[PDB]
Each structure stands twice: as structure tokens, then as C-alpha cells.
Amino acid sequence: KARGGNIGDGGGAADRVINQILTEMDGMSTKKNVFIIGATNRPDIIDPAILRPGRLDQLIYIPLPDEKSRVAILKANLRKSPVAKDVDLEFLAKMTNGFSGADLTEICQRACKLAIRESIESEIRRERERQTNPSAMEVEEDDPVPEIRRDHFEEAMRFARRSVSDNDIRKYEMFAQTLQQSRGFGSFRFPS
Amino acid sequence: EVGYDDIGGCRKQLAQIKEMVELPLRHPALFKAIGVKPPRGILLYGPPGTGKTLIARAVANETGAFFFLINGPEIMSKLAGESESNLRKAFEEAEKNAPAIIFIDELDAIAPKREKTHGEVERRIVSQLLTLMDGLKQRAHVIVMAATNRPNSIDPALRRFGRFDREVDIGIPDATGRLEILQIHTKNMKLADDVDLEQVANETHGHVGADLAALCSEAALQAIRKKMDLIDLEDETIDAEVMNSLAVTMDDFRWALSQSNPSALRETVVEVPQVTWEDIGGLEDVKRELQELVQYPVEHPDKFLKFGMTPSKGVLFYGPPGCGKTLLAKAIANECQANFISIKGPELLTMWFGESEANVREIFDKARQAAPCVLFFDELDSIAKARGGNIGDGGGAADRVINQILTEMDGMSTKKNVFIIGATNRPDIIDPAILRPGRLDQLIYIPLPDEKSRVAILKANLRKSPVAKDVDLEFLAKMTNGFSGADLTEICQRACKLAIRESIESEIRRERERQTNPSAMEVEEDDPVPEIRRDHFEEAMRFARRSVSDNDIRKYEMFAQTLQQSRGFGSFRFPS
Amino acid sequence: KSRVAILKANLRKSPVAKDVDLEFLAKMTNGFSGADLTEICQRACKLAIRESIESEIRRERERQTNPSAMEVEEDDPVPEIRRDHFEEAMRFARRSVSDNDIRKYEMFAQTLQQSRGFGSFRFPS
Numbered sequence: 001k002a003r004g005g006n007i008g009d010g011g012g013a014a015d016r017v018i019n020q021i022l023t024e025m026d027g028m029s030t031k032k033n034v035f036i037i038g039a040t041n042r043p044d045i046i047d048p049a050i051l052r053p054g055r056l057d058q059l060i061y062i063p064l065p066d067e068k069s070r071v072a073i074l075k076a077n078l079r080k081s082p083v084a085k086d087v088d089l090e091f092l093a094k095m096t097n098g099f100s101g102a103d104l105t106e107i108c109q110r111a112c113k114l115a116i117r118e119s120i121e122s123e124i125r126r127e128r129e130r131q132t133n134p135s136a137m138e139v140e141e142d143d144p145v146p147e148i149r150r151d152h153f154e155e156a157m158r159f160a161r162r163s164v165s166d167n168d169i170r171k172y173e174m175f176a177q178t179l180q181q182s183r184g185f186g187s188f189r190f191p192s
Numbered sequence: 193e194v195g196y197d198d199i200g201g202c203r204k205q206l207a208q209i210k211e212m213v214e215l216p217l218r219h220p221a222l223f224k225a226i227g228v229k230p231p232r233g234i235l236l237y238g239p240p241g242t243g244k245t246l247i248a249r250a251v252a253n254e255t256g257a258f259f260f261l262i263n264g265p266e267i268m269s270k271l272a273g274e275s276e277s278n279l280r281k282a283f284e285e286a287e288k289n290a291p292a293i294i295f296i297d298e299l300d301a302i303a304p305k306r307e308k309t310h311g312e313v314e315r316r317i318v319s320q321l322l323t324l325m326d327g328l329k330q331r332a333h334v335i336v337m338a339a340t341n342r343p344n345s346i347d348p349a350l351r352r353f354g355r356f357d358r359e360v361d362i363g364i365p366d367a368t369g370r371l372e373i374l375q376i377h378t379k380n381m382k383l384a385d386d387v388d389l390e391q392v393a394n395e396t397h398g399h400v401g402a403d404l405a406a407l408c409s410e411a412a413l414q415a416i417r418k419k420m421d422l423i424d425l426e427d428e429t430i431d432a433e434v435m436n437s438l439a440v441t442m443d444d445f446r447w448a449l450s451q452s453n454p455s456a457l458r459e460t461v462v463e464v465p466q467v468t469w470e471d472i473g474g475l476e477d478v479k480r481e482l483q484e485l486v487q488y489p490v491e492h493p494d495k496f497l498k499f500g501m502t503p504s505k506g507v508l509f510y511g512p513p514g515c516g517k518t519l520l521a522k523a524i525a526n527e528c529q530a531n532f533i534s535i536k537g538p539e540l541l542t543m544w545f546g547e548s549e550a551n552v553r554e555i556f557d558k559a560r561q562a563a564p565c566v567l568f569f570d571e572l573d574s575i576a577k578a579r580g581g582n583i584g585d586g587g588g589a590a591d592r593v594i595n596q597i598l599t600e601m602d603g604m605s606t607k608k609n610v611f612i613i614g615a616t617n618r619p620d621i622i623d624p625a626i627l628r629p630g631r632l633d634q635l636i637y638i639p640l641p642d643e644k645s646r647v648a649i650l651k652a653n654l655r656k657s658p659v660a661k662d663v664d665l666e667f668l669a670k671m672t673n674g675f676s677g678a679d680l681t682e683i684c685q686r687a688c689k690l691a692i693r694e695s696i697e698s699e700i701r702r703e704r705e706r707q708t709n710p711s712a713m714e715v716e717e718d719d720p721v722p723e724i725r726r727d728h729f730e731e732a733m734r735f736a737r738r739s740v741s742d743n744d745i746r747k748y749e750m751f752a753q754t755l756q757q758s759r760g761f762g763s764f765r766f767p768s
Numbered sequence: 769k770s771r772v773a774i775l776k777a778n779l780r781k782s783p784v785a786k787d788v789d790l791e792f793l794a795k796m797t798n799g800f801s802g803a804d805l806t807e808i809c810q811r812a813c814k815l816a817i818r819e820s821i822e823s824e825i826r827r828e829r830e831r832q833t834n835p836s837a838m839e840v841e842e843d844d845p846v847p848e849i850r851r852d853h854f855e856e857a858m859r860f861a862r863r864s865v866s867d868n869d870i871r872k873y874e875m876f877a878q879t880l881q882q883s884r885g886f887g888s889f890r891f892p893s
């Protein structure tokens with residue numbers, strides 16, 4: 001990407017760092033323990049030499065999280081935060097038709113931020129209220145917002161956004177079917 | 193004491209050293225009545241831990257010469273002004289016990305100056321050592337052998353005539369030598385019957401003799417830790433019988449190999465390839481042509497000399513990826529029993545990016561030393577691809593690395609042994625200068641494997657794996673209309689992977705049954721899948737794919753007919 | 769199966785010997801289009817016709833020299849497309865459709881696919 005991607009440099013895909021990585025991988029495998037995992041959001045521009053046998057040949061495609069996957073991602077993001085049982089998480093995950101993991105994380109973070117701001121503002125006012133009108137008997141009612149509620153999540157989802165457009169998903173689908181297992185052997189049977 | 197038996201590796205430079213030193217030492221009186229200059233100094237160089245000192249000691253013991261060892265830092269650690277006395281006394285003492293062998297271990301410390309030559313006293317030490325080394329009055333028979341990691345590390349004046357005029361690269365031991373080193377290092381530990389030292393030797397690529405000894409010691413220590421510690425019965429001296437009761441198992445050696453970290457994996461390998469023509473199923477025209485070009489000049493040099501023809505010393509393989517060009521080069525090297533050096537594309541790209549083409553000079557020198565050798569430049573078109581290929585750079589096809597390779601080849605041919613083989617998947621972008629006479633002019637085209645070739649490739653890939661006789665291989669090869677060697681290898685690997693996964697899953701479930709429902713009588717039915725079956729191969733072939741498209745084969749056919757022998761001489765007849 | 773059916777349909781009019789295993793020919797044709805199979809069948813028929821014309825003619829040319837010379841036996845040198853004709857045809861077998869433009873067709877079929885994520889759609893129970 002740094003060198004381009006649409007036109008790029010005049011030379012090919014080979015670069016110094018990838019060449020050194022290839023040399024180390026070729027000289028690797030001796031250890032029998034190190035396992036190389038590569039992640040790339042632009043498979044089209046990746047150097048083909050990276051995918052040759054003895055290199056990162058096993059290509060694995062990570063698709064956008066499904067409804068169940070989205071529910072799990074929301075639960076993982078909200079495990080630490082106090083979330084009221086009233087807010088249904090399965091409904092929110094299903095509602096998000098194509099949100100990525102990052103998008104779900106952003107929604108959860110925005111909901112937490114809204115809850116934090118509301119709690120801070122409310123307890124601050126309540127403190128003015130004692131300072132302005134000193135009550136004869138001190139009786140704190142505890143926290144006005146002890147956990148994240150449905151309204152916080154609704155306001156946060158109001159700003160929910162899909163970071164990943166469908167056109168880049170289309171390009172990934174193209175590359176995936178660019179690793180197509182032919183179209184004539186699907187019925188291969190041995191002679192018997 | 194130490195002798196040829198102790199010297200392992202069978203690397204065939206010990207024989208050269210023997211041929212060098214017997215008569216000067218084994219027959220010293222002979223040189224008294226004959227006017228000939230023996231080898232005054234021999235420079236043994238190679239990766240550390242290769243047994244250079246061991247080789248020198250063994251030669252001294254087996255020839256009876258008084259061995260003297262001048263440790264590099266031993267003299268260097270001494271006070272300035274009196275270390276020179278130590279060196280002079282060492283030479284005088286070696287002179288007294290004629291014949292004698294003076295071994296200078298770690299010579300790159302006494303005379304490391306590569307014309308940089310920092311400091312003052314070290315210059316004195318190097319100059320005085322030079323005076324002593326050149327001061328050998330050819331009387332007596334003291335032979336000065338020195339050890340150094342690389343020839344260029346020591347002072348160049350040490351490399352000059354009369355000081356160290358001949359050099360031997362011990363180099364890393366090979367699989368055969370690794371096995372022999374393991375045998376020598378495993379002779380008093382009462383090795384177990386299950387362990388064979390052959391599988392370990394094959395998996396031991398990258399180790400040196402010191403590395404092999406360390407691995408054996410680590411395996412022995414693992415065996416000692418696993419057993420005889422639980423009992424904890426220990427005394428001042430462990431009982432010999434109790435310690436002998438233990439046998440080093442294959443598992444211990446496997447763990448040690450996992451914990452090896454060989455001390456110079458990166459070092460280039462000069463080894464006779466084990467690949468044979470059997471691995472490649474065909475290419476009979478190509479096989480015969482390669483046999484001609486390489487084998488004929490050496491097997492029958494006299495007939496080449498009779499006709500006054502100099503055989504070509506360069507061949508360029510061109511063809512689609514995965515067809516076996518590297519394997520063909522290895523096979524041709526194996527048939528001639530000549531060392532094989534492979535320069536893959538990453539190395540060339542590293543030299544090009546780093547703007548360090550002097551490595552080509554070093555590579556050619558290494559190939560020259562290991563003669564007979566087949567210097568193979570795998571995927572030589574990598575630099576052209578890196579610079580482009582359709583538009584590329586503004587300049588022509590010439591590049592630094594290819595220019596250095598051409599210069600070395602032009603300055604080559606003197607050795608009469610190094611043979612350059614080039615493989616390229618993009619013949620169109622290869623520099624034309626590479627194909628000029630005196631260079632890789634003999635262009636050989638490697639086509640996609642035929643049906644018979646495909647059958648042979650499948651057999652070679654599946655030789656190790658347990659394959660059921662039910663699965664017909666000829667049918668599979670014929671079914672694959674245009675699969676490349678790489679494609680067939682992928683199909684075989686996928687079938688093996690499917691079989692392995694099925695076996696693992698099945699035995700895992702079967703173990704749950706035993707655990708869930710403990711059977712009253714234990715009766716294992718053995719392996720549910722002992723060998724690869726028809727269904728595994730059918731599922732694997734379901735994912736079979738043709739890596740090489742027909743359009744790139746069309747371009748290769750174009751270039752092939754771009755080396756067209758005209759169209760008017762086919763009927764040439766002499767007038768009679 | 770489609771290739772076998774196409775081969776059978778093309779060769780229905782032509783007299784094909786039962787010995788020729790048409791299924792083997794269909795299965796060996798990995799990715800031939802219908803046009804390629806028709807071309808192979810036409811080439812086999814042409815080879816059979818050329819052989820029949822040459823053999824009958826050369827026999828008649830020799831026989832006509834002596835009037836009534838050889839017997840009146842009514843021989844048919846080639847009365848059906850033989851196996852060798854099918855090998856002769858397959859020697860010139862050609863793949864009209866390259867895998868790249870099949871790639872393009874599958875690409876357009878994917879682009880026409882009904883997006884993604886609505887497979888699991890279910891109305892609430």
C-alpha cells in the first residue's frame with residue numbers, strides 16, 4: 001500500500017522487507033515450532049511469492065461476522081461493562097445487518113460513553129443540589145445510573161455505522177472465487 | 193588417541209588433506225633425495241565446530257608428526273612484547289621435533305588485519321608471524337596448518353605464496369556425514385534398539401559436528417532426567433549396571449532435535465543431491481540432452497578433445513512453474529555425483545536490494561572450490577520481475593546482479609568443473625546477454641508432465657505415505673489433463689491431510705467410548721484408517737486445481753518457436 | 769453426463785460401431801464445449817469418409833485394370849466409424865473456451881448473486 005496498489009512503483013510486487021521475510025521463512029521450518037500467520041486486508045496487492053509452497057500457502061478467508069457471531073462479539077465487548085438485562089443483545093446483533101467487529105465495538109464504546117457522561121452530569125447536578133439546598137438529613141440514593149440501559153444503547157445505535165462497504169466485500173469474494181477449485185472434477189470417481 | 197575413525201562426516205576433504213600430507217610426513221626422507229617443494233602451509237577454513245582442530249590432531253597422530261597447537265588468543269592474551277617470544281619459541285620447538293605440525297587455531301585473531309589493521313602491537317604480531325612463516329628455510333618438515341572461519345578474514349599476506357598457498361574448506365557435514373558424526377558421537381551410551389540414528393540424521397539438517405555432539409548429549413541428559421531420578425538412588429559413583437539399564441529412546445532424541453538451534457543453518461550448503469531420475473517420470477529428450485551436456489565432457493573427455501570441441505558449460509531451463517526444473521537439476525547433479533549449489537531467487541533479490549553484488553564473486557569462488565559442482569541459479573528472472581516486466585524501469589534489462597553473474601561466468605570456464613544451470617519461468621524478460629555464447633546458451637524447455645510423467649510424479653510424492661493398492665494411480669494421472677507437478681503434489685498432500693484428520697478424529701472418538709463406557713476387556717482393534725484409501729483421494733481430487741493456465745503455456749510455446757531453426761534448410765543436401 | 773448426451777446426439781445419424789465406448793470419450797473431454805464435441809464428431813466422420821473413399825477407389829482402380837478379374841464380392845471397407853477414427857479425431861481435439869473467460873462468466877454470476885447475510889432470515893416465532 002505504501003508503494004501504491006493501483007499503479008504503484010514501476011517495479012513489481014517484490015520489496016526489501018517481504019524478500020527478507022521470504023528468505024527467513026525459506027531458512028525456517030528447521031525449528032519445527034515457529035508458525036507464521038499473515039493477515040492482510042488487500043490480498044490482491046500481496047506479493048504472489050508469499051503464497052508459494054513452503055510459505056503462507058494456506059489462505060483462510062475471514063468473512064463479516066454472522067448474526068450469532070455478532071451476538072458473541074457484542075457479549076465479549078460488553079462483558080466488563082455493567083449491562084442491564086433489559087437491553088436484549090440478540091435483537092441488537094440481528095438488527096446490525098452487516099456491521100463488522102470494529103463497528104460493534106464502536107457501538108458498545110459509544111453506549112458506554114453516553115452512560116458515563118449521563119452519570120457524571122447527573123451526580124454533578126445532585127451535588128449542586130445538596131450544596132445549594134443543604135438537606136437536614138444526609139441520605140444518598142446511590143447511583144442514578146448504575147448500569148447501561150436500553151436508552152443508552154438506542155442513542156448509541158443511532159450513530160451506528162457500517163465501516164466496511166459492500167464493494168470491498170465484493171472484491172474479497174472475487175479473490176475467494178479466484179482460488180476456485182476448477183469446475184470439472186467435482187464428480188471425480190475412480191474406475192470400479 | 194584420535195585418528196581417522198574419530199574424524200567423522202566423511203566430507204571427503206580429510207582424504208585431500210591425507211593426500212597432501214602423507215609423503216611430506218609419512219615419507220619425509222623421500223623429499224631429501226628429490227627436488228620438490230612440499231606444502232609449507234595449509235589453511236583449513238569453515239564454520240566453527242566442524243572439527244578442524246580435530247582433523248589436524250588426527251592427521252598428526254596418524255602420520256607420527258609432532259603436533260604443536262598455537263592457540264590464537266593464548267598468544268594474544270599474553271603481554272605485548274613477550275607474545276612474540278611465545279610465537280618464536282613455538283616455531284623453534286616445532287622445528288626441533290622434525291617432522292612436526294604446527295596448528296594455529298583461530299588464526300583470525302593473531303592476524304585479523306584485512307588491510308584495515310587497527311592498533312599497533314597487533315601489526316607487530318602479524319608482521320613477525322609473516323617473517324616466521326616466510327622464514328621456513330625448507331629444512332626439516334614442519335607443516336603449518338591454520339584454522340579460520342573464512343579465507344578473507346585473515347590478513348591477505350598470509351594467503352600469499354609460501355605462507356598459506358593452499359586452502360581446504362571443511363564445510364558443514366552432510367546427511368551421510370551427519371549420520372557418521374552421530375555414530376562416532378553415539379558409541380559408548382548404549383544406544384537403544386528403536387533409535388536408528390538415520391531418521392535423526394535426516395532431520396538433523398543444519399547441525400555441525402559440535403551441534404551433533406551437543407544434541408546427543410542433550411538426548412542423554414533427557415534420558416537421565418526421565419529415569420533413574422524417580423528412584424533417586426544416588427551415591428558417590430553411579431553403578432555402571434544401573435546406568436547401563438537405561439536406553440536412549442527415539443522420543444528423547446526427538447525432543448533434543450526440537451531443542452537443537454543449529455549453529456549456522458543459514459550457511460550455504462554444498463551437497464550431492466539425493467534426488468534421482470526416478471523422481472522425475474519422463475523428460476527423456478531433456479534427460480538425454482542434460483546427460484550429454486554435463487556428463488559427456490567428463491565421462492569421455494578424450495573424445496571431446498579429439499574433435500576440438502569445447503562443451504557448453506551453461507544450460508537455461510525455461511517452463512511453467514512447478515514442472516520440476518529444480519528437481520531436474522538435482523537429478524543431473526546426482527547422476528554425475530557432483531556437488532550441487534542452488535541460488536534461489538530470494539538470495540538474488542537480497543543482493544539486488546542491498547546493492548551488494550560482490551556476493552556473486554564469493555558464490556562463484558565457493559562453487560569453484562567444490563568441484564565437480566552444478567551451480568544452479570534457480571528463478572534467475574526474479575530481478576527482472578522486481579523491476580517490472582511489462583513496462584519496468586526506464587533502463588534496459590541489464591541489472592547489477594545479472595551483470596556480476598555475467599562477469600563471473602566470463603571469467604569462469606577456467607575451472608573446467610563448475611556448470612551453470614539457470615531456471616526461469618519468464619524467458620521473455622530474461623536479459624538477452626545471458627543467452628550469448630559462453631553463457632547459458634543451451635536453452636531447454638521443460639513442458640507440463642505427460643500422463644506417464646504425471647504417474648511417476650504421483651508415485652514419487654506418495655512413496656513415503658501408506659497408499660492402499662485399491663486406489664489406482666494411473667487412472668488419477670490420466671484424469672489430470674494438465675496438472676503441473678506442483679498441482680499433483682498439492683493433491684497428494686490434501687489427500688494425506690484428509691486421511692490424517694479422519695484418523696485423528698476417529699481414534700479420539702474411540703477413546704471417548706472407552707472413557708464413557710469402560711469395557712470389561714481391553715481389545716484394541718488397531719487403527720481405523722491404516723492407509724490412504726480411494727475415498728480420501730476422491731475428496732482430495734474434488735479440490736484439485738490447475739495452477740498453470742493455458743495462456744502462459746501458449747507464451748512458452750511462442751518463445752520455443754521463437755528459437756525456430758529457420759524454414760528453408762530442412763532439406764539441406766550436399767552436392768553429390 | 770451432458771457431454772455424453774451431446775456426443776450421442778451428434779453421432780445419432782452417423783453409423784457408430786458399438787465397440788467404441790462413447791462414455792470414455794465424454795469423460796476424457798474435461799472442459800470441452802458442445803461446439804468442441806461437435807467438431808470432434810465431425811472430424812471423425814470426415815476421417816471415416818476419406819478412408820472409405822480412398823480405399824474403395826484404390827480397390828476399384830486396381831480391379832478395373834483386369835475386366836471381371838477379381839470376384840464380384842460386395843465388400844464394404846469401412847461400414848462404420850471405428851475406434852481409430854475417434855483417436856484420429858482426438859489428436860486434433862481443441863479447447864475452445866479458455867478458463868479465463870469461464871472465470872469471467874462465474875464472476876458475472878457471482879455479481880448477480882443475492883448479496884449475503886439473508887440466508888438465515890426467519891420470521892419471529
Ligand SMILES: Cc1cc(OCc2nnc(SC3CCCC3)n2-c2cccnc2)ccc1-c1ccc(S(C)(=O)=O)cc1
Nearest residue numbers: 029030031032033034035036391394395446450655656657
Ligand atoms: C513427525 C514430524 C513432526 C514435525 O513437527 C511437529 C511439531 N512439533 N512442534 C511443533 S510447533 C507448535 C505447535 C503449536 C504452535 C506451534 N510442530 C509443528 C510442525 C509443523 C506445523 N505446526 C507445528 C514436522 C515433520 C515430521 C515428519 C513427517 C514425515 C516424515 S517421513 C520421512 O515421510 O516418513 C518424517 C518427519
Ligand SMILES: Cc1cc(OCc2nnc(SC3CCCC3)n2-c2cccnc2)ccc1-c1ccc(S(C)(=O)=O)cc1
Nearest residue numbers: 489490493496497500501503504528530564565608609611
Ligand atoms: C579435453 C577438454 C576437457 C574439458 O573439460 C572436461 C571436464 N572435466 N571436468 C568437468 S566438470 C563436472 C562434470 C559434471 C559436473 C561438472 N569437465 C567439463 C567441461 C565442460 C562442460 N561440463 C564438464 C574442457 C575443454 C577440453 C579441450 C577441447 C578441444 C581442444 S583442441 C586445442 O581443439 O584440440 C583442447 C582441450
Ligand SMILES: Nc1ncnc2c1ncn2[C@@H]1O[C@H](COP(=O)(O)OP(=O)(O)O)[C@@H](O)[C@H]1O
Nearest residue numbers: 198199200201240241242243244245246401402
Ligand atoms: N566429524 C566430527 N567427528 C567427531 N567430533 C566432531 C566432529 N565435528 C565436530 N566435532 C566436535 O567438535 C568439537 C570442537 O570443534 P573443533 O574440532 O575445535 O572445530 P573448530 O575449531 O572449527 O571449532 C570437538 O570437541 C568435536 O567433538
